[PDB]
């Protein structure tokens, strides 16, 4: 692997990165977690299996 | 006694401590360092809850309750009659616990096998501890952990399961209550198989790994295999006994409001029309 | 109903007591069903032990064994029984420790010890033998994970005893079973085998802790190089575990 | 009883926020006036005053009138009586009357 | 001035793919960030332009 | 798997420099800190 | 560390399995069709292998396809056709039993009228799975004991919305289908009759919902511990015991001072798991037929605890110094 | 310019059926953005019209 | 134009069924959505025309 | 238009027209259940009220 | 002067994946923490400028 | 102070990473309670500056 592990790793950063984007701009934290773990497991996901 | 085999198993050494001072056989069972405190432990435990409940009146093991403190007693001893029996269970019921899982180890490093077993125990022992001192510190008193009664620790988790107006809506409980129901499914899957393939209708040969492998392909189109189903099924029943703890842990130490507002947040998304 | 049939005991209570009576039937039948192997108890010295326990041994049951292996009756002889093991006794009495008399990795005893199984290879549906080396395998190969053909192998205390040269595969099931060791001249002579439970696998190298150096040219040997029997199989894994506790005294002795 | 489970949780820093509007309430109440003998009375002091308040001392109308439209956010409550509010209002106060007395 | 040498080191498929989505999530949420304010959505403004 | 004594002279070397550098730096940003606004 | 056995290191995928086959003919219903997956082998098997279709499969298939219809499509038009208010309130929707002052007959259409034909579905799929798995392993010569295992989970499944209704003279006692609606009326149908922790057969089901949990946790970890010694190939070590079923079954006699079989550990599994379902179905029977009130039967039989604490909070503290104040 | 060399490096069957799908779902976000505002949703719109 | 190349690339097969399934979708969703609104609710505007 | 036969030469004749036929009736199916809960096309409660 | 020995010891592919998910990550999350302040937040600054 | 010896015992690799990433740990952590309090907040200090 060693690839597949580290598009998983920029997925759960960029789920980090949207809860905590999403708060700024208002919402809440279980509001912008519930899309941070939806963005961790999409666009994860798509790089993982787009590029390997 | 021994058994056909038990013979040649029998060697001296992989003690974690105490060497062959207790490293011997009582019976069948394995006496080590932790068996002894096993024994103490849980002899001291069990005669404890029998003063206490000739202290309470009544001997029949249905209407037994040896409950916890007040709240007012805070974190602090209580008096022995009134909860203070309790705090000293639930130090020999740890400390017995405790105790059986390092003597598993015991065995199992004297067997030559891996420590599987004794592992997965401690989630069985993580979910006791966290019901009984982990919740109870984080709200700050003793009494809030479950009575030692066989009929009594029920209405606790009918008065606690209350507390929160429905404890169905809890998300912990509800990816908890997942796992119990599909472990049962997992394990009466699994043990249909080996059975089934080990006990053919009468006058056939029995079947191989390979013909139940094939049975749930042709069942459900897929099969784990025969490794697959032991390893996966030991994390469901992990996992079950680990968000069994985080469902409790919550409920009062996190959330304070009744757990069907928790799903507020989902209601009133700002994507949602109003 | 609401109406008891006599006191307070009415249909619902009627349906408890019948449980009861059926559990306890069930707990009879369930653990004769376990007394297949292993009994009668036997003793510390090989005589069969004053107490045998309060169930008594089940009615024998047969498997019809496939591939005209015959039939096997669970209740009686056991086949699988050692004989001229290298243990004495550290006491007179029951209930102590057995102490190898010799070298327990050799002598297989305790952890080290197998058990003798049929000395034939272990089959699949069509008849052939389960367990084959990819060599002879036909449209296999490694599709994830790191590949250990080439990779040296690193014994339990760092020495390297040789290079991964081929790898046994269950191509029933797609799993891997073995790893084959090219034994260094420097450590041993010809080709040994690990299970796949005992091996570690790194990026440059396979760690196998349970065995030092000086261990492996002691590893049991096949007879054949493109399969193994089950009594093979059983000597050989035993071998690896054995090491656990045997490959020093630090092992051996408590570690508190 | 102890063991038994019932109890109330609550977060020690929701528990030292009191009600926001306790003060607001005692930022608008005042000690009420002991009338004297042969008071002034509202019916009189004033004009189309209903009989339900009509029989209150000068001041102590004044000051329940100033209060109830502060508490209710009307500031010209009660000062046109064929307004609907108005007859809202003297009805309620029979309504807060019977709380306190019958419940 | 020498960069084209950084192809030496990083596939060209690898990061094109890396590159692409990069991109477009990027603006995808610099565009939801000013439509969160009230001073940038150009849907809000049209309506409260056209009264 | 384990260095020679002439790799050490310069991998020390290396990193004796880069540490005072970035304690340089360091030294600097604390004491136009303390200028700013002194915590003493 | 010693290799834990949680995860495969290497992957091997040659052919695909077709399965064995007998005369039967087992590979004419066969789909043909596979496919492997690499993420699903890091812990079982990699191969999405061919799916046996019959008749029954497909029965099932298509009438399961009609109740998730019937259930889901009136829930669509329960939000008048609104997609985001459907999305938002999927957990919350349902479709309702029917009234109660319909008895047994049948209601009308918006008033559970759905409910009985959805029902009537789901139990045409439900049964015809079940007989898939008594052919399938006709068909395979194998014991019935899949088939068997099913019957038990179906047993609570009649009983929950079929014998039960049938009983109490009621369609209304059934469950409702919506996510959190099966759940309310969980707890509802606990509250309506007393308390069913004080249910003797809830509680024996308890017991073996425990058990099953218990008991896999504890024969998980114990392959996975003697899959060095090939443990994990039960069927073989059952025909032909090695050291892996001698070293498994000495672990527990010195533990616990009896063990097992490799063969009838299986047994046990199997028992406590199919008993969870047997005896909560014999509960749930009972309960509203027969007793209507749980705690005041437990009351009645000596089993309720006792206690002599006062119940107000004004006993154990008071409202000021709960507030600090 | 010379922007065709890109088929060298990506496949022409993997990044086309990427392409259709990302082109749909922007397209769909998109139409639905303007449905959730008061001032671009058509439908909405043609109901206060006529009324 | 030249088009036609695609099928060099896509599947005539599998591209096909995957129309067929995303055309009905499609239609099957508008049709959903207008039955939301009170203005395009054929069913329930037959009913206030015959009242 | 005249020309639409070869698409049998794509499709297998067995598998388009099982699933031709499962999809016709549960399309036929959906409008009858959907009439069904309209106020207006139920002939079922039509038929009652005149009597 | 010497630190150029810095790239005989990590591999230029590793670290520079590394770099490049930091060096955003670090300009990211300044970013945001600059944005919830009211002082540096040029969005709400045009808003209450234009006002 | 020479002190090379250390370096014969370690792996630079595993050094050099172990303290690069806990001297920016240590370094965000400072930074961070430095602005919690609120004499030190340099971003809460230019906003009570300029008003
Ligand atoms: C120093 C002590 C340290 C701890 C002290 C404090 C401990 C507190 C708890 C004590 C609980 C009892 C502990 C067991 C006593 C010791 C056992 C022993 O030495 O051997 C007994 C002795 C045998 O001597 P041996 O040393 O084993 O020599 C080898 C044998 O000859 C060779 O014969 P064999 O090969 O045929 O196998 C022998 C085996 C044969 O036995 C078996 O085969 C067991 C199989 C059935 C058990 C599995 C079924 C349970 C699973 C479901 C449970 C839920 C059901 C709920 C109800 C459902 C509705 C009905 O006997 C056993 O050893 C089994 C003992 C454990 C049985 C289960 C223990 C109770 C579990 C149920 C809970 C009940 C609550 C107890 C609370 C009591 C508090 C005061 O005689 C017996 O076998 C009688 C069994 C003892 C039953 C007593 C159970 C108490 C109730
Ligand atoms: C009104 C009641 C509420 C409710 C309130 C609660 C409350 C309150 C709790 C749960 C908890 C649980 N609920 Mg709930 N829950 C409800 C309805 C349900 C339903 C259902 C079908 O309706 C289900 C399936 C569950 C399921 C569960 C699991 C999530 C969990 C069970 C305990 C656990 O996992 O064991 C874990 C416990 C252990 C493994 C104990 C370990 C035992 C030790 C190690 C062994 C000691 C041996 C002993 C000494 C005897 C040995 C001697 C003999 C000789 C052998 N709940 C209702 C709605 N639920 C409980 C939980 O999660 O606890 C963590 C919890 O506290
Ligand atoms: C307030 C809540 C009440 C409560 C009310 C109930 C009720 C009500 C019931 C139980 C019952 C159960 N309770 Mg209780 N119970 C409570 C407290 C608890 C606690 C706890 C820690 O507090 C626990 C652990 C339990 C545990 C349990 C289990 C022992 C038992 C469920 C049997 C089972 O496995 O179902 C598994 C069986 C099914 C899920 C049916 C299977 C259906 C068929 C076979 C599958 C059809 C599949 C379907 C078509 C979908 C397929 C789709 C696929 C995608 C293709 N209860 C409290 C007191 N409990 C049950 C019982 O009584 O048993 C006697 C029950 O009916
Ligand atoms: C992964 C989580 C699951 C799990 C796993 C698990 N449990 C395990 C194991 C594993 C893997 C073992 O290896 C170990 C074992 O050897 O079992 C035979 C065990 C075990 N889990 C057990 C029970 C058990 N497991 C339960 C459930 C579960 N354990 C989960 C479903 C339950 C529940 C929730 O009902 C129970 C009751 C035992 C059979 C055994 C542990 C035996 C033990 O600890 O022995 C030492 C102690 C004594 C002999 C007596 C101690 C007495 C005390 C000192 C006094 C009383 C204290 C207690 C709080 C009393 C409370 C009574 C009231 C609540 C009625
Ligand atoms: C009692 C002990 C455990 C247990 C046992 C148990 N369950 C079992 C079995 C056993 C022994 C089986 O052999 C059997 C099985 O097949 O297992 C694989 C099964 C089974 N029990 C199941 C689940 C299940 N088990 C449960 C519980 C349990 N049963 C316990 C954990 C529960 C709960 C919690 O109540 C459930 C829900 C099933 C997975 C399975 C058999 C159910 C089944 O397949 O029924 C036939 C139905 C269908 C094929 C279709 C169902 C509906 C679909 C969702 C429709 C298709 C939708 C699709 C998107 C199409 C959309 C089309 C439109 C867009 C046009
Ligand atoms: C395929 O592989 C596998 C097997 O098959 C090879 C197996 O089998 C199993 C085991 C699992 C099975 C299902 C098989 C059979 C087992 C069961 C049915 C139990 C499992 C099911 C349950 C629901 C769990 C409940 C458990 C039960 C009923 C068993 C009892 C459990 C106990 C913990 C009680 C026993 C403990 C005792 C008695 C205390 C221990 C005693 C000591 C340490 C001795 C102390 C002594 C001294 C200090 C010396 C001084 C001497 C004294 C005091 C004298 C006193 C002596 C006495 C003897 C009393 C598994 C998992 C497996 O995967
Ligand atoms: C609720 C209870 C839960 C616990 C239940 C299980 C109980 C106990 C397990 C205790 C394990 C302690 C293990 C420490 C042993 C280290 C001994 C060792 O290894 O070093 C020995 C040296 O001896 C010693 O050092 C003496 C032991 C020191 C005592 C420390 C007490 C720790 C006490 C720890 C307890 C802490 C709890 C704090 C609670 C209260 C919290 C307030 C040398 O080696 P040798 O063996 O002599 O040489 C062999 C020769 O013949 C040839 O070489
Ligand atoms: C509230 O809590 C508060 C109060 C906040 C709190 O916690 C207080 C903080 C406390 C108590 C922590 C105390 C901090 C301590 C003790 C940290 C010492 C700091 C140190 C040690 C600085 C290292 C700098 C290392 C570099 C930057 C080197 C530069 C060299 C680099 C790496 C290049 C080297 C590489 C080469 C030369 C190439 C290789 C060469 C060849 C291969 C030849
Ligand atoms: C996008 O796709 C479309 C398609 C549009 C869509 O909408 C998607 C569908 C969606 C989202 C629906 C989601 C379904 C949900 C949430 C349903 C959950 C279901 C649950 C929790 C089940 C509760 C337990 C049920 C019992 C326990 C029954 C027991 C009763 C059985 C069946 C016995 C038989 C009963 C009878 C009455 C017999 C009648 C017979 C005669 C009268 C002969
Ligand atoms: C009218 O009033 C006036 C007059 C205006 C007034 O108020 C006076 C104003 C005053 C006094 C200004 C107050 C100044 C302040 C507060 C200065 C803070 C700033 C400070 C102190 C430092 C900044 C520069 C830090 C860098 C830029 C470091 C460079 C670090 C680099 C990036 C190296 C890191 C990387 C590595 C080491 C890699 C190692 C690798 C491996 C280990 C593999
Ligand atoms: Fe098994």
Not at chain 5, 19 to 38: D, K, N, P, R, Y
Request: proline share 5%.
């Amino acid at each position: 692997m060693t690839c597949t592990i580290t598009c998983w790793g920029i997925g759960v950063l960029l789920g980090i990165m949207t809860t905590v984007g999403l708060m700024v701009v208002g919402w809440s934290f279980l509001q912008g977690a519930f899309m941070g773990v939806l963005a961790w497991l999409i666009v994860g996901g798509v790089l993982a299996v787009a590029v390997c | 006694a021994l058994l056909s085999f038990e013979r040649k198993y029998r060697v001296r050494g992989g003690t974690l401590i105490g060497g062959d001072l207790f490293d011997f056989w009582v019976g069948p069972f394995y006496v080590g360092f932790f068996g002894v405190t096993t024994a103490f432990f849980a002899l001291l435990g069990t005669i404890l809850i029998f003063w206490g409940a000739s202290q309470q009146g009544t001997f029949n093991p249905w209407l037994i309750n040896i409950a916890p403190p007040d709240l007012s007693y805070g974190l602090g001893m209580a008096p022995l009659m009134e909860g203070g029996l309790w705090q000293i269970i639930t130090i020999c019921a740890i400390g017995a616990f405790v105790s059986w899982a390092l003597r598993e180890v015991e065995i199992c490093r004297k067997l030559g096998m891996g420590y599987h077993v004794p592992f997965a125990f401690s989630v069985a022992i993580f979910a006791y501890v966290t019901l009984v001192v982990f919740r109870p510190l984080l709200m700050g008193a003793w009494g809030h952990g479950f009575p030692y009664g066989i009929w009594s620790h029920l209405d606790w988790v009918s008065n606690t399961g209350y507390a929160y107006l429905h404890f169905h809506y809890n998300p912990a409980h509800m990816i908890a209550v997942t796992f119990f129901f599909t472990t049962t499914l997992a394990l009466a899957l699994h043990g249909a198989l080996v059975l089934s393939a080990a006990n053919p209708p009468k006058g056939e040969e029995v079947k191989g790994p390979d013909n139940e492998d094939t049975f749930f392909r042709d069942f459900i189109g897929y099969s784990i295999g025969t490794l697959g189903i032991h390893r996966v099924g030991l994390l469901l029943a992990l996992n079950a006994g680990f968000w069994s703890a985080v469902c409790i842990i919550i409920s009062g130490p996190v959330w304070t409001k009744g757990w069907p507002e928790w799903w507020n947040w989902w209601l009133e998304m700002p994507i949602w029309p109003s | 109903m609401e109406e008891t049939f006599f006191g307070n005991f009415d249909l619902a209570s009627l349906s408890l007591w019948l449980f009861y009576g059926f559990f306890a039937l069930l707990i009879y039948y369930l653990q004769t069903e376990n007394m297949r192997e292993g009994y009668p108890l036997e003793d510390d010295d090989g005589n069969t032990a004053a107490n045998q326990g309060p169930f008594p041994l089940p009615k024998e049951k047969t498997f019809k064994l496939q591939h005209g292996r015959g039939e096997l009756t669970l209740p009686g002889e056991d086949v699988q029984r050692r004989d001229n093991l290298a243990l004495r006794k550290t006491a007179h009495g029951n209930g102590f420790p057995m102490e190898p008399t010799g070298d327990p990795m050799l002598d297989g005893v305790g952890p080290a010890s197998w058990s003798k199984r049929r000395d034939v290879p272990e089959l699949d549906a069509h008849g052939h033998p389960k367990i084959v080396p990819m060599s002879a395998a036909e449209g296999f190969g490694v599709s994830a994970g790191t590949d250990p053909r080439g990779l040296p192998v690193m014994a339990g205390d760092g020495e390297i005893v040789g290079l991964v040269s081929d790898m046994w595969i269950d191509e029933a099931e797609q799993l891997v079973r073995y790893l084959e060791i090219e034994l260094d001249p420097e450590w041993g002579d010809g080709k040994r085998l690990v299970q796949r439970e005992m091996v570690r696998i790194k990026s440059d190298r396979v760690k196998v802790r349970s065995i030092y150096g000086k261990h492996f040219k002691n590893v049991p040997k096949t007879k054949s190089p493109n399969q193994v029997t089950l009594l093979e199989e059983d000597k050989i894994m035993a071998y690896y575990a054995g090491g656990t506790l045997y490959a020093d005294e630090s092992r051996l002795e408590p570690q508190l | 009883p102890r063991g038994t489970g019932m109890s109330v949780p609550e977060f020690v820093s929701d528990l030292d926020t009191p009600d926001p509007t306790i003060e607001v309430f005692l930022a608008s109440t005042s000690d009420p006036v002991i009338p004297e003998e042969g008071a002034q009375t509202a019916g009189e002091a004033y004009e189309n005053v209903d009989p339900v308040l009509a029989d209150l001392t000068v001041e102590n109308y004044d000051r329940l009138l100033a209060a109830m439209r502060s508490w209710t956010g009307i500031p010209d409550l009660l000062e046109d009586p064929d307004h609907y509010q108005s007859k809202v209002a003297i009805n309620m106060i029979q309504m807060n009357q019977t709380i306190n007395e019958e419940w | 001035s020498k960069f084209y040498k950084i192809w030496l080191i990083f596939d060209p498929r690898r990061v094109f793919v890396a590159q692409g989505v990069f991109l477009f999530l990027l603006a995808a949420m610099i565009h939801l960030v000013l439509l969160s304010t009230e001073h940038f959505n150009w849907f809000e403004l049209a309506a409260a332009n056209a009264a | 798997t384990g260095l020679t004594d002439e790799q050490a002279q310069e991998l020390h070397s290396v990193y004796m420099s880069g540490l005072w550098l970035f304690s340089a730096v360091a030294v600097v940003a604390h004491l136009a800190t303390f200028i700013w606004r002194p915590w003493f | 560390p010693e290799y834990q056995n949680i995860f495969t290191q290497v992957q091997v995928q040659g052919p695909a399995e077709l399965g064995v086959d007998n005369e039967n003919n087992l590979t004419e219903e066969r789909t043909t069709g596979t496919g492997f997956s690499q993420l699903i082998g890091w812990i079982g098997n990699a191969q999405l292998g061919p799916i046996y279709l019959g008749w029954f499969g497909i029965i099932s298939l298509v009438t399961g396809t009609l109740w998730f219809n019937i259930v889901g499509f009136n829930m669509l038009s329960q939000v008048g056709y609104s997609i985001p208010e459907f999305i938002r309130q999927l957990f919350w929707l349902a479709l309702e039993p029917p009234s109660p002052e319909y008895g047994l007959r049948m209601p009308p259409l918006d008033d559970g009228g759905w409910f009985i034909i959805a029902s009537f579905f789901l139990l045409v799929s439900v049964i015809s799975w079940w007989l898939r798995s008594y052919q399938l392993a006709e068909m395979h010569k194998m014991g019935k004991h899949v088939a068997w295992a099913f019957a038990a989970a179906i047993w609570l499944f009649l009983v929950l919305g079929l014998f039960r209704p049938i009983l109490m003279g009621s369609w209304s006692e059934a469950v409702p289908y919506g996510i959190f609606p099966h759940l309310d009326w969980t707890t509802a149908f606990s509250i309506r009759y007393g308390n069913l922790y004080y249910n003797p057969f809830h509680a024996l089901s308890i017991v073996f919902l425990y058990g099953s949990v218990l008991l896999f946790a504890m024969h998980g970890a114990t392959i996975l511990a003697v899959t060095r010694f090939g443990g994990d190939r039960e069927l073989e070590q059952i025909y032909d015991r090695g050291t892996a079923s001698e070293r498994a079954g000495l672990f527990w006699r010195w533990t616990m001072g009896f063990n097992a079989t490799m063969e009838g550990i299986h047994r046990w599994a199997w028992w406590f798991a199919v008993l969870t379902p047997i005896t909560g179905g014999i509960g749930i029977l009972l309960t509203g037929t027969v007793v209507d009130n749980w705690f005041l039967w437990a009351v009645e039989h000596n089993f309720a605890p006792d206690y002599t604490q006062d119940y107000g909070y004004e006993a154990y503290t008071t409202y000021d110094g709960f507030l600090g104040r």
